[PDB]
Structure 1
Amino acid sequence: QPVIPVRNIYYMLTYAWGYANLEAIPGNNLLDILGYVLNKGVLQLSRRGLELDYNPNTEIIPGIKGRIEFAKTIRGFHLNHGKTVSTFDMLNEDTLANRIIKSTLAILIKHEKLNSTIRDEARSLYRKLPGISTLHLTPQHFSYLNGGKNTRYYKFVISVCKFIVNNSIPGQNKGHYRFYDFERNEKEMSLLYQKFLYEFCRRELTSANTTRSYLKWDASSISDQSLNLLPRMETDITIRSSEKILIVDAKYYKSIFSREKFHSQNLYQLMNYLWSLKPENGENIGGLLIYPHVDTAVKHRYKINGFDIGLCTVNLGQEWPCIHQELLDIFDEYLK
């Protein structure tokens, strides 16, 4: 049952979310890492100042505040008991974004398997935010916040809040929670990998242009021009440069972690992407298969059907900088 050290995933999640010292914490497991980011992350915000959104308030008060609503006043006859219905803007920190932080912290404490200090420190924070009201979180709450009015820093911790709630399962007790075994499932780990690269390549490969490209089948059918039944095909990433184009397909498989047979079923998808894609520039066409391995990294090249294709691996579990060096080394070879 071999897996990646948990700390390294957080780095990939960071690029996945598109935006610190982790050596200090002694808990290798993820929630210890993830909570310490948040627990420190909240405190980092408070230094600068949390978001305060003017919420208009229409209420019945004994006097003039802001703009009086003449209609609701006369209709309810509130003048007679010395009151008016007036609209004014109380400034609160009770916004959806901040409510989510507080509700997330409640979930974090309730998790049964967690560092005690992490749980101790967070309980302070929950008390330190009296005005904010607890909420029962759903993805629909996060859906409303896709507008992204908030600052760039807020979006990072909220992304963490999205990860925690979805990857939280009740355990021994009804109240308490237990963390999901994220590493074991390939699909979510794989979907992380594909998104990890797409945002990563934009950062480092300033030389090349990095875009996801939709592809269209060359087919025509007398039955339907739509071709809906045909598989929808959208590249994982395309990283185009003037001298050479390159398509990459990346996936996480358990079989490859064992140093035997090889799982390369994804390759079957790849040629059709090369085929359906036709470049106006006509500089070259290349493909790449990249997978995660634990122990070591090996690079091969192939000349299959007039295409220059590479199968390669990365030794996750080594260290983040050499991994960062290794990736830049990787794309340097093929992007030429």
Structure 2
Amino acid sequence: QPVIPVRNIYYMLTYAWGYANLEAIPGNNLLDILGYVLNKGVLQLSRRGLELDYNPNTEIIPGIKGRIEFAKTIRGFHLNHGKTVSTFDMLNEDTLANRIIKSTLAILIKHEKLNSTIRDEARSLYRKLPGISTLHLTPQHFSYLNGGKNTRYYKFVISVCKFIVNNSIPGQNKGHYRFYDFERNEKEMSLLYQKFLYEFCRRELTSANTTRSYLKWDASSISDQSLNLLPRMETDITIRSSEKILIVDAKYYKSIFSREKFHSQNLYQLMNYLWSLKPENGENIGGLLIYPHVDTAVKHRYKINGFDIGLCTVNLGQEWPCIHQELLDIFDEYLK
């Protein structure tokens, strides 16, 4: 039952979200890492200052503040008891972005499995936010915040809060929570891996141009030109350079972690991408399948159907920089 060391996963999430010392913390499990980032992360923000968004307020007060609304004033006859309906801009930290933080911290405290030091510190912070109102979080709240008015730093922790909320399950008690065993399921870990590379490649491979490319079948059918029933095909990544193009399909499988038969079902998708893809420059066409392995990394090359394809692995759990070196080393060979 082998899985990745948890500290390494957090780095992959970082590139996935597109944006520190984790050596100090002694809790290997994910939520200990994740809460410490958030719990420490909030402390970084307050030092600079949290976002205060002017919320206009239309209220009934005993006097003039800002602009009086003449209509609501006369119709409700508020003038008689010395009041007006006036519009003004109270400055609060009660924004949706900031409200989300406090609600998430409550979940963090309620979590059954958590370091005591981590939980104690957060409870202080929860007290330190008196004005802000707790909320019952939904993705629909997160949906509204895709506008991204907030700063770049806020977006980091908000993505963290998204991870916690979706990966929160009730455990022994009605109130308390228990963290999801994220590593075990391949799909979400795989979907992380696919996103991990795409944003990673833009950062380091400045020489090359990296975009996900939609592909269209060469087919024609008498029945329907649409061919809607046919499978939708969108690359995981394409990393194009002037001398050579390359398409990658990367996925996380449990069977491959055991060092026998090999699970390479994704390859069947790959050739069809090569076929539908036609290069105007005609420099070259290359393919790569890359998977995560724990113990060691092995690289192979193949010449299958007139295409030059590489199968390779990476030893996750090794070390993050050496992994970062290994990834650049890997792509450099094939990008040639």
What is the TM-score of this pair, normalised by structure 1? 1.00
Superposed displacement of residue 34, structure 1 = 0.2
Q: Is 1:21 equivalent to 2:39 in the alignment? A: no
Deviation string for 1:155-214 (max 9, x for gaps)?
000000000010010000000000000000000000000000000000000000000000
Aligned-residue offset at 1:24:
0.5
Shift in Å, 1:299: 0.3
Q: Deviations over 1:69-107 (max 9, x none)?
A: 000000000000000000000000000000000000000
Distance 1:20 1:39 in 2: 13
Aligned partners of 2:171 and 2:322: how far apart in 1?
38
CA distance in 2, matches of 1:20, 1:271: 41
Measured after TM superposition, the shift of residue 298 of structure 1 is 0.3
CA distance in 2, matches of 1:245, 1:33: 38
Q: 5 Å matches for 1:1-336? A: 1-336=1-336
Question: Matches of 1:281 and 1:167 in 2, distance apart?
Answer: 46
Deviation, 1:148, is: 0.4
For structure 2, list consecutive stretches of 5 or more residues without a partner in the other structure: none
SS in 2 for 1:264: coil
**C-alpha displacement at 1:254, in angstroms?**
0.4
1:238, distance to aligned residue in structure 2 (A)? 0.3
Q: CA deviation at 1:132?
A: 0.1
Cα distance in 2 for partners of 1:167, 1:311 equals 33
CA deviations on 1:224-261 (whole Å, 9 max, x unpaired) are 01000000000000000000000000000000000010
Shift of 1:275: 0.3
Instruction: Name the SS for the 1:330 alignment partner.
Output: helix
Quote how far apart the aligned CAs of 1:307 are: 0.5
TM-score, with length taken from structure 2: 1.00
- 1:45: Cα distance to partner? 0.2
In structure 2, what is the Cα distance between the partners aligned to 1:281 and 1:102? 54
Instruction: Quote the RMSD (CA, aligned, Å).
Output: 0.3
Measured in 2, the distance between the counterparts of 1:90 and 1:53 equals 9
Separation of aligned partners in 2, 1:262 and 1:168: 34
The CA deviation at 1:302 is 0.4
Task: Report deviation, 1:54.
Answer: 0.1
**Separation of aligned partners in 2, 1:278 and 1:51:** 49
How many angstroms does 1:154 deviate by? 0.1
Identity %: 100
Name stretches of at least 5 consecutive residues in structure 1 with no aligned partner.
none
Q: Distance in 1 between matches of 2:62 and 2:281?
A: 73
- 1:245 is paired with a residue whose SS is coil
Q: What is the DSSP-based 3-state SS (H/G/I as helix, E as strand, rest coil) of the residue aligned with 2:146? A: helix
Write the distance in 2 (CA, Å) between the matches of 1:81 and 1:3.
70
CA distance in 1, matches of 2:121, 2:79: 50
- Provide Cα deviations, 1:291-334, integer angstroms capped at 9, x if missing partner: 00000000000001110000000000000000000000000000
2:246 aligns to what SS in structure 1?
strand
Give the whole-Å Cα distance in 1 for the aligned partners of 2:135 and 2:281.
54
